[PDB]
RNA sequence: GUUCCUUAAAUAGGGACCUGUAUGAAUGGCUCCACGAGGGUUCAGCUGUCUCUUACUUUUAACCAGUGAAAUUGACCUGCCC
RNA sequence: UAGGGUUUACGACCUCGAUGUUGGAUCAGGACAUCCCGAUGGUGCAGCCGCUAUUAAAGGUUCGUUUGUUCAACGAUUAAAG
RNA sequence: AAAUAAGGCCUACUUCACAAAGCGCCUUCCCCCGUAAAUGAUAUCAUCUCAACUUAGAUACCCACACCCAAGAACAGGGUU
């Protein structure tokens, strides 16, 4: 069980230098059309994902401020708006949740 | 051996994993977006598929009511579910949940993904937009199709 | 309009061509004999033909304990204590040694598998060998003689007290006690009842099977 | 099914099998290359502190499809030539033994009922 | 491989390309459906020493089959899909012939394979099993081989992979008895005890040890055929067959000494639908097989 | 040990013989009411201990991230047969 | 007259600043002075049952009751429990 | 027809379920040197050859990014119309 002979530096090098253990190079790094932050295939961007996360967090904070206490969950849909923008004539009963913000160049 | 085996073991047993999946489904029904590992993400997506199916079956049905009361621990999401996610998708059949992928976690580096119901009021996600039709290969294929059509 | 449980395939992935060929063979076989539809707990009487017996024609009576299998395999055990001796024969509806499949009754007994009859006293097993049929109410709800079954002393062979079996027929009040019922319920799994992923849908498959049966009957 | 040390239930008119005893008679040895007994096989049976041959007439495990399955290890006694000891068997006997005709002829003639 | 095709295609060219691929494959199959009409090379009669080309079917499932004597006999399922010849090579030790099977998409393949399959008709297949045939029977490439190649009452061998159980232990890999549960084991229940002797400080090559079970080609000899189907091109072989369901299997004539000189009634080259041959019924039965629909048996 | 049983086999258990030649009496000889985690057998039930083992959950194992020891080592470019 | 170091010893030649002691479990490698499946000669070979000498080790070599003991007694098997 | 050891399978039977396993089912094929016999000399008899010459005397598997997997610890492999 115990080492009968210490491994030589040559053996150690040959063990810790073969291609099987070396980090395999990858070639799945493209250029994201948005903000060019070199994204990966089959994976979303980084800056766009952070922006979406921040927007969702702000929307959730606004909903909580409007909803109030916990244990609510109304049975009505939601509609997000921005500075100005008259509410859509189709969504009149849906509770509107917004505050102050400008529509970015990627939100419908 | 695991030939043709479904349900990947997660927690310390069936009860733990099903409770975790139920909690994830409740969180998604409450917020419509969760960042969870790929395995748990796909499991919760498959569960929410049947959940929406049951919700669409009908509200007066005692089976669907019991399923909604069980799979939802808060007990406040059952009406929202039944009255929003069932009538909104009255035209679809099985086009729910949109799964993607997250780069990785900044802590232990884990494969995470995102899933959400279509038509949500939240901002849109950067879906993988295919190449435009005005490219070289697309134009060549369009010309080939036009020639094949004119051949008749 | 109930569809025999032999046509409904299993969830196992495979080529539908195999199931189609199996259904075609089953229909071609049924075209000869009759093979009436029956549920669990119903008394049956299959007249088979054996190569060595008092006459090439054989007979036997019993209650269908259960039934499973797919394709040409439609097994069903027939229970009938004769001369104070338990006997069980595993017959298949798609055998060449079949002539007549007479049905005496049509019951369900709630439980879809009367495998606990082996542990039950002989009173709920002995039946007449030359009994007459009992038909009534054509095309109507099948009767269900909802009745409990007393069990022998504690020495069993399958632990029917646990809830995983789900019988809803054994009379545990006249056999088991409070501690036994508690120890049995200890191994409960309420999550299985709510597991909506284990259910195997069959609406489209049932419609396809009915369409194929109609096409085969009309041609 | 009927291997070594198995409480065998005898069913014959022989006084040795019908008389009671303070020890249940169980098999002795299986006359087969393998350690498993089936229908139509000779086996030694200890009865009343004495050794005597027997014959397996039905087991408790599930056999082939077109065959029965008893709930008790039914066994019938037999001598050297056999030449069965008993004279009447009220319990049923599977028809699988009828294919013998030569090895156990008198046993079939004495058999009353059949499955 | 290189970059997968579905990368630079918009949301309108994918279905068009799929339909074009399907139409091209169907047209090639329809054009190759006529072997006799095209140069089929001279056909020779049956000879004492000569073999024929085999088939490559798909193992669907299993089902029982009772004979006229009233006995259960397990039977397998083999679907003969397309099954075309690729090329022919003369003298190695004997002539050879390549045969395909299923139709695999021509997108995830090597450029050399794509060029080779473009030189000939039909689309690229999955596997390519080479059969050791004699110089007598020599079929031209591009011809089909349906299930009619074989006939009932014939022993046909089959070989294919097996349900690999991965790097298994010892008991499941070789059937070892392991160690008891008590008296007085503490950590020994499935491990291998002694290796081999003591003084020998080596290990006998080939000694039974943990390894990758299954996942290897294994042939089975002695498998009788009961019934065959012409419409769906199915072959029902007796006994099980190596390989999981929906797995390609190589089938060819047997090789036992008692079954070698009996192909006089069988087609020496291969079945030819175009004839000048008299088509066969929906499915040929056997002399000792209960037909579907025949009256019940009776041993009286 | 002889001797009769207890089972299919009994150097396991027990009924009597002194021949224990070195047993034998408050260095205590014998029976007995209740009892023994003390040491050896057994009748009707019991379980995977085996006949022949298999399926599932966890502990646990492998990979991806972090840290991170000890027993030990003359150097090894370390095969096999006579 | 030739072969054995498998039993009992005989000698203490490195191994008491360590080679962990028998049976019983999984696994068996090899040798034939071969129990059996293959082939021969003789025989106190009318045939089986037998005996002897040569080749053939590709294969097989049981289930249990006791004493801790391989060995040691016994019940039933198959051609054999080397 | 049964077992032995090996190669496979879940459609019927069971442990059980989207699998796997056996109690359940299919397959396993080549002679082995030890003898007995034509024809004649050393030894014109006779005689089987450590004298010349004749009798019982290889077949099988193979060699063109990303999702799922009956393939797999990774790696690797199969499918992705
Ligand atoms: Mg875990
Ligand atoms: Mg074991
Ligand atoms: Mg242990
Ligand atoms: Mg660890
Ligand atoms: Mg690490
Ligand atoms: Mg140390
Ligand atoms: Mg010395
Ligand atoms: Mg020493
Ligand atoms: Mg010392
Ligand atoms: Mg030392
Ligand atoms: Mg010798
Ligand atoms: Zn971006």
Coordinates of N, CA, C and O (backbone and C1' of nucleotides) in Angstrom, one line a residue, chain B residues 6 50, chain C residues 8-14 19 70 197-201 205, chain H residues 17-19:
Chain B
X6 N -35.5 6.8 -16.3 CA -35.9 8.2 -16.2 C -35.9 8.6 -14.8 O -35.7 7.9 -13.8
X50 N -47.4 18.8 -17.5 CA -48.5 18.0 -17.0 C -49.4 18.9 -16.1 O -50.6 18.7 -16.0
Chain C
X8 N -54.1 -2.8 -25.6 CA -53.4 -1.6 -25.1 C -52.0 -1.9 -24.9 O -51.6 -2.7 -24.0
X9 N -51.1 -1.4 -25.7 CA -49.6 -1.7 -25.5 C -49.1 -1.0 -24.3 O -49.7 -0.2 -23.6
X10 N -47.8 -1.4 -24.0 CA -47.1 -0.8 -22.8 C -46.4 0.5 -23.2 O -46.2 0.8 -24.4
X11 N -45.8 1.2 -22.2 CA -45.1 2.4 -22.5 C -43.7 2.2 -23.1 O -43.1 3.1 -23.6
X12 N -43.2 0.9 -23.0 CA -41.9 0.6 -23.6 C -41.8 1.1 -25.1 O -42.6 0.7 -25.9
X13 N -40.7 1.8 -25.4 CA -40.5 2.3 -26.7 C -40.2 1.1 -27.6 O -39.5 0.2 -27.3
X14 N -40.7 1.2 -28.9 CA -40.4 0.2 -29.9 C -41.1 0.7 -31.2 O -41.5 1.8 -31.3
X19 N -46.5 -3.9 -32.9 CA -47.9 -3.9 -32.2 C -49.0 -4.1 -33.3 O -50.0 -4.7 -33.0
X70 N -49.1 -8.8 -23.2 CA -49.4 -8.1 -24.4 C -49.2 -9.0 -25.6 O -48.6 -10.0 -25.6
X197 N -46.5 11.9 -13.7 CA -45.6 11.5 -14.8 C -45.7 9.9 -15.0 O -45.4 9.5 -16.1
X198 N -46.0 9.2 -14.0 CA -46.1 7.7 -14.1 C -47.3 7.3 -14.9 O -47.3 6.1 -15.4
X199 N -48.4 8.1 -15.0 CA -49.6 7.7 -15.7 C -49.2 7.5 -17.2 O -48.5 8.3 -17.8
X200 N -49.8 6.5 -17.8 CA -49.6 6.1 -19.2 C -50.8 6.4 -20.0 O -51.8 5.7 -19.9
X201 N -50.8 7.5 -20.7 CA -52.0 7.9 -21.5 C -52.2 6.9 -22.6 O -51.3 6.2 -23.1
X205 N -54.0 6.2 -28.6 CA -53.8 4.8 -28.8 C -55.1 4.0 -28.8 O -55.3 3.1 -29.7
Chain H
rA17 P -42.5 -1.6 -9.4 O5' -42.1 -1.1 -10.9 C5' -40.7 -0.7 -11.2 C4' -40.5 -0.8 -12.7 C3' -41.1 0.3 -13.5 O3' -40.2 0.6 -14.6 C1' -42.0 -1.8 -14.2
rC18 P -39.3 1.9 -14.5 O5' -38.3 1.7 -15.8 C5' -38.7 0.9 -16.9 C4' -40.0 1.3 -17.5 C3' -40.1 1.2 -19.0 O3' -40.3 -0.1 -19.5 C1' -41.0 3.3 -18.3
rA19 P -39.3 -0.8 -20.5 O5' -37.9 -0.6 -19.8 C5' -36.8 -1.4 -20.1 C4' -35.6 -1.1 -19.2 C3' -34.7 -2.3 -18.9 O3' -33.8 -2.6 -19.9 C1' -35.2 -1.0 -16.9

